[PDB]
Amino acid sequence: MKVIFLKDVKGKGKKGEIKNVADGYANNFLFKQXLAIEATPANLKALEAQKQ
Ligand SMILES: [Cl-]
Ligand SMILES: [Cl-]
Ligand SMILES: [Cl-]
Ligand SMILES: [Cl-]
Ligand SMILES: [Zn+2]
Ligand SMILES: [Zn+2]
Ligand SMILES: [Zn+2]
Ligand SMILES: [Zn+2]
Numbered sequence: 001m002k003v004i005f006l007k008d009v010k011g012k013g014k015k016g017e018i019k020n021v022a023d024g025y026a027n028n029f030l031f032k033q034x035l036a037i038e039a040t041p042a043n044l045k046a047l048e049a050q051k052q
Contacts, residue, residue: 001026002039004047009035018044 001023005013009030013019018039021030030036037043 003030003036004039004043005030005036007035 002018002020003013003026005015005017005019008014012021012025013036021036026036026038031038037047
């Protein structure tokens, strides 16, 4: 699944990147720890607001 990284995660992604990762890894680790959020149009839109 495509995610938006909110924080660097060594070996997987850097803050700001939008990229595909393993679904299990996103669900059980990234989302659970606030390291990334799902890349959906609603989320991208919301994140741009929160950055501004
Ligand atoms: Cl998925
Ligand atoms: Cl770095
Ligand atoms: Cl990377
Ligand atoms: Cl970086
Ligand atoms: Zn999937
Ligand atoms: Zn970094
Ligand atoms: Zn990268
Ligand atoms: Zn948010």
